Every structure is written in C-alpha cells, then in structure tokens.
Amino acid sequence: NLWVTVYYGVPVWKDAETTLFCASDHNVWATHCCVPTDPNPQEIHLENVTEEFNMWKNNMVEQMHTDIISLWDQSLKPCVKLTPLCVTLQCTNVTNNITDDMRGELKNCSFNMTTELRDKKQKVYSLFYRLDVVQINNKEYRLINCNTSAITQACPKVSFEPIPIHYCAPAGFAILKCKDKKFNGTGPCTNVSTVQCTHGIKPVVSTQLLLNGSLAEEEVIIRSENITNNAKNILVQLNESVQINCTRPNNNTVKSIRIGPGQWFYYTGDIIGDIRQAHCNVSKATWNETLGKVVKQLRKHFGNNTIIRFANSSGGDLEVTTHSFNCGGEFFYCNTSGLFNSTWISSNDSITLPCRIKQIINMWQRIGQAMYAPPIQGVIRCVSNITGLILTRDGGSTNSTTETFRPGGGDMRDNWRSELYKYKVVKIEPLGVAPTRCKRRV
Amino acid sequence: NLWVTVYYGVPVWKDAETTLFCASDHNVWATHCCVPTDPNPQEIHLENVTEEFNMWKNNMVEQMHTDIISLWDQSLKPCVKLTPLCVTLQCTNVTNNITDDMRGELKNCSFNMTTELRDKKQKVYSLFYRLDVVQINNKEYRLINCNTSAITQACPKVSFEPIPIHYCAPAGFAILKCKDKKFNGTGPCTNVSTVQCTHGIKPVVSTQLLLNGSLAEEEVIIRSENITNNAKNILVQLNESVQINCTRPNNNTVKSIRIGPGQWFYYTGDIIGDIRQAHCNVSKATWNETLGKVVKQLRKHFGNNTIIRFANSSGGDLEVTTHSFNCGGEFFYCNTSGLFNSTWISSNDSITLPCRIKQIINMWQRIGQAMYAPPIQGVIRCVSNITGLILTRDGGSTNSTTETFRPGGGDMRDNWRSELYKYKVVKIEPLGVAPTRCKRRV
Amino acid sequence: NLWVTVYYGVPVWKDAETTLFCASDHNVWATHCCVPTDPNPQEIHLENVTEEFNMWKNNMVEQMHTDIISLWDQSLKPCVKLTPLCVTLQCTNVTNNITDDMRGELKNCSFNMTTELRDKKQKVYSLFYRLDVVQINNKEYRLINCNTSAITQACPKVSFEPIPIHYCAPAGFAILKCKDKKFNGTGPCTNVSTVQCTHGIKPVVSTQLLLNGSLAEEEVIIRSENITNNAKNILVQLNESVQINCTRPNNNTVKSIRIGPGQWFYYTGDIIGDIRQAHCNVSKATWNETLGKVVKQLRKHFGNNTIIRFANSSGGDLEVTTHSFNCGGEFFYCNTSGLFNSTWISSNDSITLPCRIKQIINMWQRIGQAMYAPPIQGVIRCVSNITGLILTRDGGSTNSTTETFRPGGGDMRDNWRSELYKYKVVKIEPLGVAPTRCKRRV
Amino acid sequence: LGFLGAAGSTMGAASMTLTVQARNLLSGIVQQQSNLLRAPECQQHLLKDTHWGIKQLQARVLAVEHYLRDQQLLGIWGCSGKLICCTNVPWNSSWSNRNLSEIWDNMTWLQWDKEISNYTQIIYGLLEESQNQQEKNEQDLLELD
Amino acid sequence: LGFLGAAGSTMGAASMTLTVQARNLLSGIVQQQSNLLRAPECQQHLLKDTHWGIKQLQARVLAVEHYLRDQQLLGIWGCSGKLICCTNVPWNSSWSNRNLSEIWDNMTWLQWDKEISNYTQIIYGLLEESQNQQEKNEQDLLELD
Amino acid sequence: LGFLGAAGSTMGAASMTLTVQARNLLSGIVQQQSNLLRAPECQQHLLKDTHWGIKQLQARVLAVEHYLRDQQLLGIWGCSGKLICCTNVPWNSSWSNRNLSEIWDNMTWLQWDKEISNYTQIIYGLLEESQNQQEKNEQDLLELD
C-alpha cells in the first residue's frame, strides 16, 4: 500500500516561449542591451539528460526578429525626415573621370530644398546613385520612395554596428544549450548544459552569405528543415572561414544643409578621384576549397555518384538576387555570380565581385517605410568573414543526378537561426507527486 | 462562551468597479477583443440570493464608453490626414438628373491638392454633400471642419461593423446576471446567476432609435432613472421588433489620388443614374402596433385616462435632432418626424423617412477632431432591427393629462445602458470571521 | 551554547533610491499630483536614532529634477506649434512714447502667417522683445530659435504656477526627516522622525536668488558641499525673508489668429501707455541687514578678520548672468548687480533692479526645444519672498583675506536641494537573526 | 455547487466549498493569462497598444496584491496554513448577540458579513495582538527547557 | 550539483536539491532586478521605451503569478510549509503500476513526470478534498473538548 | 510606539512591535492603491501618461517581489508561519562574540545588523541546509511507522 507524496523543488521541464531579455558586455545595441552580462559566465552540465532540440521551431529566432525590428524603428524615430526633399530633381550624368561599368551609375541632381525659414529655398547639387533615382516622364527625376513611403534620414552619429548580444532567460526559465558537435539542428542531443545567457550572437544582417557567425567545430554542416523539399533553404555552416575584403574606392566630400529648425540633411556632394566601381574580393583558392567541402557534405544527402552544380540567383528584386551587406553604415548589393558559377563531378588570383551601392533602403521589407543612409566621408573598407551560405536546391524530378544549388536565401531569420540552433527555452515547473510509504498523521 | 474562528474561502461580496477585459467569438473589434470567449459558456445559478442592481449607476456602461472611444481613436491613428485638402474650393451645383428634394444637396467642387512631389498639384473634381461644405464669403467654399479641427481619413479597408462583444471579469471579480424578466433596471433581483463573461453586446451607435439590441422577454419595458423628472431619458425596450430598410439609391464611382508619399485619398468622384434622396422604410402597420404597445406601458406610469402624444425633436444640431446611423460605413442622419407625429387617446403602406448623408463626422462629440468617411462604391442597402426607443418626456405642469414624448435621446451611453442592465460587477472578498465553540490550543 | 533565532518584522534600514510618488492638497501640478495628501499628517518620532544625512547625494533631488522635466514636456505636448511662424520678419523700431533704457528694446515686426486654409496667408503686425528676434543680413529678421529648434506655444489656459508638492514613499519605503535646526546638510542628525510624505515643496524655478522656500529656524545657514572648492556652490538659507516686488508696467492688448485648423496663436499686438522698463524692487535697508547676516555666517568658515566682498556675475548667457523668474507666466531676467555691489569689513529708499523680458525660452537647457510664452493681457505684478541665495566663492590663492562672492548659481537642482535637505529615503528590510537560548524541537 | 454556488446557502453548509472560492483567485489569474498567451494577435495587441497593455498589468498587479493582503493577515494571526482556524480571542456579544444555532443554520455568509461589518477592524487587531503574545510565550518555553 | 544539476539524477537522489530549485524563482527574480536597477542607462531605457518596459513588467508579473499558483496549491493541500509532504490520499495503480524501488532508484523526475502526466489534474483534486475534510474534523474535535 | 517607533529601542524591546513592521508592506501597498483608485482624475492620469503609469507599476511589482523574497526564505527555513522562529543551527562566536545579555538589552537592531552584516549570507545558507535535512528525517520516520 503506497501513499501520495508531494514534492516542491522538483527538477522538471516543459517547453516554452518567453520574452527573453538582452544583455551585453552612440551604438544602438549597447543602448538597448543596457543590462550587463555575467562577469563570470557559468553553465551546469547535466549528466544523463537527453532532450530534443528543433532549430526550425526555435522561438528564440522569432523573438530576435521582433526586437531587432523594434530597435531599428526606435533608433530612427528621433531623426530628420527627408520628406521636404521629395521634389522634382533636375538630373544630368556624372562624366568626370568615369571608368567603364560606372558610366551612367551616378547622376548629378539639383533641387530646391527648404531652409531654416519657410520663405526661403536653397539650390542644392548632390550626386546620387542610379538605384535611388527614377525618371518621371537634362530630365526630371524623383526619388524611388516618393510614390510609396516617407523617407527618414538615419541619424549620422548613431552606430548600428553589431556587437555581441546575449539573450538571457527571465527568472523561472532556463536555457538549455546543446554541445553536440555533430548536431544537425533537429532531434535528440545528449550533451546538454543549463545556462542563464546564450553565447553572444552578432546581429548581422545579410542575404546570401552569412557573415561574422560561429564556425562549425569539426566539419562543414548542412542543416535544413527537409532535404527533399526544394521550397526550403539549406543553411551551410563552415568549419574554416573565408575572408572577404569589401571596398568602396571613391573618395567623398560629404556636406550638410539645414532642412529645417535644427534639422540637418547630409548629402553626397562631390567625389574625389576617379569614379570607380565598388568591389568585394574573395581569394579564389580559398573559395574553391570551401566550396569543395560543402559539395562533399551535400553528397552525403544526395548521393556520391552525383553531379553538383552551382548557379547564380534565378531573378527578382535586388535585395534577393544580390548579397546585401552593411559596411561602415553604407549599403552594399554584391553580385555573387562569380562565386557560384561552377560544376563539381564524382599572384593571389582573387575573385572580384562587382557591387552596387544604394542609399534608400526598404529595410526589413516593410513597404510603408524607407530609410536614407547618409553618405560617409572618405573611402570605405571592411574586412569580414564568410561563415556560412544559404543555398536553395533548385529541384526538379529529372533523376539526372545533376543537383543544382543557388545562393538564394533572402530571408532575414535564417541568419540567426544558424546561430541560435544550440539553444532551447524551457520553463521550470517544480511541483509534482510520486508514491511513497509515508502517510501523514490524521 | 463562544470563540472567534477565521474562515478563508468565504462566499462574500462587495460592489466594485474594475477594468473588465473584452473577448469575442480587418475588423477593429475583432482585432481589439483578441481574447477568445468560453467555448462552452457557463453560469452558476445562485439559489436564495437577492441583490440590488442599479442600471443607472452601472459602471460597466462607463467602461464601455471609455474603451469604444479608445478603439476608434487607435483605429484612425495610422491613416492619411486630409489636412492638405483644407483648401479653397471652387463649387457649382450638381444639375445632372436631379429629382426634387435633392436640388442643391450636392455640389461639384474642384480644388488643387498635393501630389507625390511637393512641387506639383493636381486639379481634382469631386462631388460633396452640402452638409460638409460651407461658403466662405461659382463661389468659394471650405470644408466644415477647416476652422475647428484636423480632418483624418478613415482607412478604407478597416471594418467598424459591430460584432458581438463580451465583457469578462478579471480574476478576483465576478459578474452577477439578473434573470428577472420583469426587471425595470433598479432594485432587488431574486433570480441571479454568476458568470465570467456577459452576453454578447453589439456596440451599435445611434441617436433616437436603438438598433440591433436585445428584446424584452415578455412585454415592452419602460425603464428610467425617474418618472417625474423630464430631464431624464426613458429607455424603451420592445419585446417584438420593427424592421427598418435603409438605402442610399445613388450609384458611385469612387476614385483615388495620392495625396502624398504612399498616402491615398478617396473621393466621391461622380454619380451614376439619377440623383436621389436616401430613405429609411418602416412598415406603417408594424410601427403603429409597436407604438401602441409603448403607449399602454407608458399609461402604467402616467395614468390610463390620459392622452399620450408623440412629437418630433424640439431643435438643435443634426446629430441630436435626427437619428444617426452607420450603414456599411456610410453616415446617415434620418428624419423621424414621420414616426412620431401622432396622438393616442383612452399594398404594404410603408412610412418613408428622408435621410441626409454626411461625410465629415464630429464623432463622439469631441470638438478637436473629425473623421472623413470615405465614400463607398455602388448602391448601399442595410436592413436592421429597431429594438428600442429613447424618449424624452416633454414635461410641463399643465395637469391636462396630455403627456407628450419626443425622440430626443442623443446620448451615447444609453445605447449600452439598455443592454448591460442585467449585469453587475462584484468583488469577492473571501475572508471573515464568526463565533464557534472551538478554542485553539495554547 | 547559543542558537540562531530568526525574526521577521525587525526595524532595520538600508539606504535606497526609489520612484517616489507625488501627492498634493487647469494647473499642471494639480493634474499630475492627483493623489491626495494625508488629511492628518503624522510623524513618528524615533527615540535614540542617529542617522547620517547627505544633502549633496540626496536622490530625492534627482527624482524631482526628472519629474519636473517630464511634467513640462507633457504639458506642452498637446499645444500649437509655431513652426509656421519661422518666417522672414520685416521689422522697424517701436518709437511710440519710449522712455530711455527701452529705446531699441521693442521691435514692430510684420509677417505673412498661415490661416485656416492652405491657400491663404494673413499679414500680421506684432511687437516683439529684442531678445527673441535676430537680424538675418526696415531690415529682415528671424526668431532666435529658427536655426536650432522647433518652437511650441504653451497653452494659454494652462497654469504652471507652483503649488505645494508632497513626495511620498511607496510601500516598503519610509522617509526619515531631520529636525535638527543647526543641520548644515551633511552628517549625523539625532532628532529624526519617520514620515510617509514630505513637507510640501514649491517647485519654484529661479537662477540666483531662491524664491518662496522655507526659512531657517534660528539663524542664517551656509550650506555647501565643500568650503575650499570654488567650483562648488554655496546655498544660503535665510531665517528672515526679503520681499521683492516685480512689475512689468506696460499694458497689453493681446490678440489671436488662427494659425491652422483649430490652432490658435497669441501675439503681443500693441502696447498701451508709455513703453517702460520692467523692474524688481528690493528694500535697501532690508537687503543690507540680510546681507550682513550672511556675511557674519560666512566669517565663521573663512575667518572673522577678513574682508567679504560681493560682486555681480562674471559673464556668460543671460540665463546664468541674470536672475530668472516666472511672474504670472511671463519670463523675467533681472539684473542683480544692484544687490551684490558691496564690501564688508571687520522715504523707503528701495533698490531698483532693471529687468528684461523674453518670450522664447530654452527652458531646462535643452538645445533641441523651445517654448513660446504667450503674452499676458494687462499689467503684471508679482510679490515674492527671497528665502535664499546661491553664491559662488570666486576663489584665488591670494591670502589677502578679501574673499569675494558672486550670485552665480544657474543650476536648477540647487533650488530643491535646499528644501529637501531634511529628507532621506530608506528601504525597510525586516528580516534578520540573533542568538538566543532556544533550540527548535527536532 | 461550483464557484459561489454556496452564496445563498447557510454559513454552515458553505464551509464545504471553502476550497472552491479560496483557490479561485490564482487559478483564475493563471487561466486567463494562459488564454491571452495563445496570442491570436493578443501578444501583439497587448504590447503594441501600450494604453491597453498597462490597463491589463494594472488589473493583474492589483489582483495579486489582494491575494497577498489576505494571506499576510492569515500569517500574522497564525492561520496561514488552513482554511478554517480557531484562535485565542473570545467572541464579544457587543459584536453580535445572535445565538450560535442561528448563525450556523438560519443565516448565510452575505447576511452575516453585513451584520458584523463595523467590527471587522477591531477583530483583526485583537487577533494580531493575541498571536504575537502566543509566539513569545512559546519562545520563552523553549529557553526554559 | 547546482540548479537543475539533478535533472538527470534519480528521483531519490534529486530530493537533496529541492531547496536549490525551489528558491530559484524568487532569488532569480530579485537578482535580475538588482542588476537592472544599477541603471547603466537601464532605468532610463526601461521607462522611456514604454514598449520594452511593458514587456519586462509582463515577464515579471507572470513569474510572480506562477510562484503564487504553486504556493496556493500547496496551501490548499496543507503542504505550504514544506518541500516534502505526505498526504492522506493512497496511490492508484491505474496512475502507475511501477514498483516503488524502480520509481526512487532507476528513474529520473523528468521521466516520471511524463509517465504520470495525464493524472496530474485528478491527483490534485483528490488532495484538495482530502485536506478540507481533515480540517473540518480537527475543528469538530476542538468543539468536543 | 507605531511603525519603526522601536527603531532606537533595544533588540529585546523591539520584539513586541514585530507585527507592526511585518504587516506594513502589504497594508501599505493596498492603502496607497485604495487612495489612487478614488480616481480624482488619477485613473485617467495613470493610464494616459504611460510613462508615469509604468513607473508606478514598476514600484508595485518591486514591492511585491521583495515581500515574496522574504516569505520564501522563511518558507525554506521552516519559519513561514511565525514572526519569531527558532532553528537547529548553533550560533558561531566568529559571527559575534558579544554576551547574550548585551545583545538583548544594551543594543538596538540597527546596531546589531551592522555588527553581523557580513555573515548574513552564510547564516542563511546554513538554515536552508538544516531544514532540508530535518524534513527528510521526518519523512523517513513516517515510512518506518
């Protein structure tokens, strides 16, 4: 004869979603994630605990893509609107020392903008990139956002540079971290520790290559929701890294005008030196070895008597067909066809990728808003790491074995999903019962 | 010798006011009342419980007329302002196929409105209803709201159509529901149940007749704060219902213009077919029977050797003298003199009530705001139920017995007071003491 | 052998900072401090309690200078912006009956402002004080705020008049009040009571003299963070008081124009009678006695064989060099050189201090905002009490004994620091242990 | 009988539903929140409409404060672990001179609460003092062992 | 072992860490708030960014409500003052027919909770009724003294 | 003496006001809210001025969390139902070597708290462990009956 015994403080878990808070070691991330991190991070290894993780259902990703949006919108809120500069522009071509490729890329536009007083306008001359200016019908033009959204200038002293971000469980919750080096994002993990805060994640935003992430511990890992479904993306994590050097070679003399009462507008103004194309440099040998490693790991899922072909994007908007990247605050749209033009079968020699620059960005894909990225004075250079790829299997039931992959991607959640895959949020519910031989006195 | 004993979990009540939350089964009500209702509504009948209810002091009414206001203001917040269209209008009369009554009702106004660019204006022609346009001194006119408030266009895809709304007590509170079919709104009720959520209420807004409410279970009920005081309204609930058919017979070709950067303005544009008067149709026989039932119930409070006369409103603003009604999103102001012109003493033959249409509405009687109701394409027809009346006793110490009542009303709270009369909010305070024969060991 | 005993309800304190709430007996303070005060204020005298107070670290001051800012910003939020009136002004001098001193002080400016309709402008003539208008280069002028901030008109019916404010501890906290009449703001106090709410404080804002504060109980008290450091201010509290009579002798005919859709602008319009200088009147004998008392108390810290000299401000912006004062809603900038021109060594005859008036105020020293103080119809007179001074020791290691003090001040926190010096916020932590002779049964 | 189903029952009968009402405040708070957390666009409404969101936080904080208020009173009186507690304070005929057989048989809790409403504060003060004295007596008895 | 360090340990072994998990919810809430209150521009962010600020209040109110929910259940069952409590309700073989020696030696709490997950609601209802009956019996015994 | 009127009294004398301070946090929270709820335009200010409104929610949530923190510590130590509790942990002369007659006669609680301030964390840890061991011992004694 057994009796019910009640226990409180019982180590029992349920899956949960909660409002995790941010912590971090004139930057926006630093301002928002004001809460300090542990001075001495700790984890508790849990012996004999097996739990299932599911990267594709990780609600930490969904929270990260909710707070990052909020942070950008709050950061751009107390800034100058450029709606007074949605005026008819009078534009001619920039013909001053133009190299090829760049011919017709920049236009010299002039317009009448408002000033401190409502009774006066100022004639302004400024260079614009072609992507930001469209013809109305030398000729009359308008900014690309004039018929769809208000344009807001990002504040020139605000830094959006990613810094490490740590997500922390609120009391009553815990985060389980998977230490299994072979973990493919889905299923049971047998080497689990409990932490209060995650590994720092850098909130990098990009579209085809994943930049400045974590590296795989032992081998390149192909992670996907499914293998068969060609509507799903493949997140490829590299073990080694590929360095990419991104430069905008043009020099700039950035000038400012008061648009209104204490409201300053920044504009490109002129360009010093030759007008040249922005480029991104990837070492060819490093890239070919990296891609070969990816190919071998893909063979494990598709067959090892196959042909693996890479191709560029099938088409669509610039934001998807090219590799979007934020360099020093400038917005780059890099052409990756030079990286994915190849077929694999069973001095330095770098690869140069041309890149476009765009100042008006429909950031986070909201049709009703756009931001103006002010120009940066001088020459811009960034050096960053390719830590992963987003591939799309092209599909087709041809049974030819010629699987084809493209640098599709274009999603914004995938960039963090590939980093937060090791974590799960669990709610602790420390109350339960079990039989014993003890009856309470009555 | 008796001793004090403390009990917790005691079923004891105190009257209270709390922030009840909404629940409901691109509509605004659906968006706001996101919380689901009970899939299986339950009530607990309370045997041997007598409580006093007071409809006139029901704080549930006051909360409903606080949240409805908030909901409209939030719904209209992320919408296009029409302040750029507070310009001098050049207006002539609409003379195209005009029936009588409508002569001079519509005006053809033209104006120069802003466009996507700040350097260009667009000439626009649009028809307006006379009530929205006033002469400045063919002739120059301005919109009625230009000298008192900013005008905001309601978003064209947002539905304000009433849906059932359920008010629910927060934990710690309960709602007591009166089941007494004879209950007149004030005093003790002996057939009381406890519920978590109220009967759904439709948040219908009207001024003289109460539309789409609940019906009285057995007889017409005359409910008032007082009988003698002619400064108080009488809420009359009908047991049967009177169907009213409201139509705006004119066809419309609604057009749109960008007013600004992704900001669209909708305007009436032209009219197809004849220009005709909007009307509301009430069956005469049904109305005469309904009114006769009301008269008999009024006799119970005033005497049954009396003369009961009905008359129309004494005067004042359109919003009070006429019966305001929202039909498909259009705003109707119906002339009810045809319903209340009668004296009672001890084929179909319908009653046709003419009705005006107004696009600029000083909704909820706030002098500082106005909304523009965009026009609706096509012909509009609504069929709705008259479930009650708001009558004002005219008063006068004549002792002639000729009591006179008018369709005054005009208040906005009365519409819900007549529906929420069965409910009271009670706070539960489950702690108390009583004597027993038990002393604690010490 | 002693055993641990746990006690709860223990009267033990820790220093703390918390979000104290306001309570008070169309005013903004009355609206904000909606919470009523004790109808019967009580204090608990604490026998045998010695605590250290530190006026200079009093976090109650910091909270007061956080909520006062918020209150002004919220109060000015739902008001008319005057950005439509940042236009080129055409200005000439006011030459109508001008006394000396005032020649060139007022200018007659005209401009084209917006009206109810966007298609019409109105020519307006209004007088402005010189301090609000600057030349652009008779002549063209702009308002002083046009090149730095948006200007907002304060709402004409909103009263900012200080009323007594009581700060109250939230539950779990208590306020300790120092009753020591000799207390100099820092160190141990042996006559301490506990209160829930503070003595009412009037949120008066001024820069050189402290107006309408508390008086010292027995003698003039010199309170400072340090004596030696000449970078610190000296807050001087008087025991008696000096009456100061502030008048703006000009009569005014204030007029209004609609600037926009229900948006009214108020302007000075013309002036009735002679154009005269505003003045502040301090009795000379009273002032000389008051200053002599201050001098004797300063001798206690600097030596009593010394020479104590007073001098006016060394220079800088009007807001610091003069004594700022809010009179009936008008903003005064009084020249105090007539009060501080003296050296002390070991009919009525008043002192007349000239005063300037300024309508555009960079209130609370935020560069990005400014408020427009609407003019007040008629003649303005205020009678107020000088309850203290803010002095700056000029310093210099001369060893001449000629200590020199100036009416520097200019800080905004000092005005409340001098009133809240008697209070400290303490957190109650009623849990602790001590040894006893009792062991629990096990 | 269900929640408050005992409201019209006699005081005696009502003792058997004390667990029904006593548990209702927190299970009520939690179940309502569990439905809100289903987030059929509620999490978004709750956090975006900050006015509405604080009305909800205000309601929940207040419900919690009332729960704790009553639990603390029971704690102070030495009654926190039970729904029914006897004390060491005698009943005053000045509060009520009604027969015990009437109180527990011919009257409901609502009626009773009205009958002795004006004595609530004094009874509670007496309970607090009696309990403190009793705890001191126990501590001294242990010291003397 | 530390917080949840016992998660993979047997049910028996885990009884010695009940104080570690039980105290963690409130010490957790308080320590996180103590760091937030250091205000390295957090008090300013917390109150200025009202959207973020209500997300934090929402998290804290919810954590408190869960603490109280469990404490109230223990109160109703007569178990509030202890981490380990015996009751007067027999164990049903229909909930689990596993041997006692397996339950406390060859199995962890996570595994057990899954094994009897569908009986949680019934067990709790039985505990509530049994405790109310016991309290009434004690009151009557005092009346009879 | 009233709230904290015992602050300068000796530790011994102060034991008679433990109910005064102990009850003050929640009765304080509730009375302040009852006055705020009179709504002399406060409900409107509280909810309209969202910045101010969250400052008030922040203060109340924090006050509740501190109440619960202390109650949970008393729970863990087996002290939750009383204001005065003895335990099974001996006093260390290394924490304080002062005479018992001085502690309860010639010194106040404020002075004492300063004297042993650095031992608070260790004493609390000892209390938690001792109580868990005692509860296990009782459970085993029942098994053996």
Ligand SMILES: *[C@@H]1O[C@H](CO)[C@@H](O[C@@H]2O[C@H](CO)[C@@H](O[C@@H]3O[C@H](CO[C@H]4O[C@H](CO)[C@@H](O)[C@H](O)[C@@H]4O)[C@@H](O)[C@H](O[C@H]4O[C@H](CO)[C@@H](O)[C@H](O)[C@@H]4O)[C@@H]3O)[C@H](O)[C@H]2NC(C)=O)[C@H](O)[C@H]1NC(C)=O
């Ligand atoms: C992957 O990670 C790399 C490494 O972080 C990123 O590349 C870095 O990007 C940042 C941001 O642009 C660079 O930081 C900037 O460097 C500029 C150059 O200054 C040089 O000299 C100083 C001398 O001390 C060095 O400290 C500095 O590293 C450079 O060598 C500065 O002019 C910039 O300052 C300006 O911007 C900051 C922005 O916060 C402002 O705070 C300043 O006030 C000022 O306006 C800035 O410090 C960094 O140098 C880059 N590193 C490399 C490798 O050169 C990649 O961008 C990242 N990948 C992606 C996707 O972005």
Ligand SMILES: *[C@@H]1O[C@H](CO)[C@@H](O[C@@H]2O[C@H](CO)[C@@H](O[C@@H]3O[C@H](CO[C@H]4O[C@H](CO)[C@@H](O)[C@H](O)[C@@H]4O)[C@@H](O)[C@H](O[C@H]4O[C@H](CO)[C@@H](O)[C@H](O)[C@@H]4O)[C@@H]3O)[C@H](O)[C@H]2NC(C)=O)[C@H](O)[C@H]1NC(C)=O
């Ligand atoms: C008292 O109660 C009655 C009954 O609800 C109200 O009358 C109804 O009003 C609504 C709102 O205008 C009507 O719903 C609308 O009907 C239009 C006509 O479509 C007809 O055909 C479809 C075919 O399936 C039927 O479902 C429909 O009932 C009609 O017979 C639609 O064109 C409307 O759609 C448009 O508006 C909605 C608004 O939410 C949008 O969501 C749509 O995208 C679209 O823009 C709409 O469905 C309803 O038909 C009326 N009923 C009657 C009797 O005809 C009274 O208005 C109410 N009293 C008061 C005071 O308002």
Ligand SMILES: *[C@@H]1O[C@H](CO)[C@@H](O[C@@H]2O[C@H](CO)[C@@H](O[C@@H]3O[C@H](CO[C@H]4O[C@H](CO)[C@@H](O)[C@H](O)[C@@H]4O)[C@@H](O)[C@H](O[C@H]4O[C@H](CO)[C@@H](O)[C@H](O)[C@@H]4O)[C@@H]3O)[C@H](O)[C@H]2NC(C)=O)[C@H](O)[C@H]1NC(C)=O
């Ligand atoms: C130190 O303290 C003194 C004393 O409070 C302050 O001086 C007072 O300032 C206030 C605010 O300007 C004065 O109150 C105003 O008085 C005006 C004159 O009316 C006279 O006649 C009435 C008749 O009943 C008297 O009640 C009144 O006291 C006057 O004698 C009124 O016209 C004003 O009303 C207008 O302003 C208020 C502002 O809230 C509005 O509510 C009204 O609707 C209206 O627009 C107002 O009542 C007060 O009279 C002054 N007292 C003295 C001594 O004369 C000092 O200002 C203060 N020091 C500082 C630094 O400000």
Ligand SMILES: *[C@@H]1O[C@H](CO)[C@@H](O[C@@H]2O[C@H](CO)[C@@H](O)[C@H](O)[C@H]2NC(C)=O)[C@H](O)[C@H]1NC(C)=O
């Ligand atoms: C409401 O009051 C009635 C009496 O008016 C209660 O009826 C008693 O019910 C019990 C149990 O069935 C019977 O033994 C009694 O004989 C009934 N009384 C009479 C006078 O016949 C009824 O129980 C009360 N309801 C509640 C919920 O307490």
Ligand SMILES: *[C@@H]1O[C@H](CO)[C@@H](O[C@@H]2O[C@H](CO)[C@@H](O)[C@H](O)[C@H]2NC(C)=O)[C@H](O)[C@H]1NC(C)=O
């Ligand atoms: C995880 O499981 C292992 C067994 O697989 C446990 O190991 C036991 O540890 C105790 C104490 O050192 C030894 O006496 C036993 O002999 C070990 N078991 C075996 C089969 O060798 C280990 O303790 C478990 N971890 C936790 C945290 O409970």
Ligand SMILES: *[C@@H]1O[C@H](CO)[C@@H](O[C@@H]2O[C@H](CO)[C@@H](O)[C@H](O)[C@H]2NC(C)=O)[C@H](O)[C@H]1NC(C)=O
């Ligand atoms: C503050 O300290 C004084 C002693 O300095 C305390 O006075 C004692 O009061 C009791 C009761 O009236 C007398 O029996 C003692 O004889 C007094 N002591 C002396 C030395 O005369 C006083 O009680 C203390 N106050 C508080 C609140 O504890």
Ligand SMILES: *[C@@H]1O[C@H](CO)[C@@H](O)[C@H](O)[C@H]1NC(C)=O
């Ligand atoms: C007013 O007169 C002074 C000379 O006294 C001159 O300097 C100033 O420019 C004049 N102002 C205007 C508006 O004419």
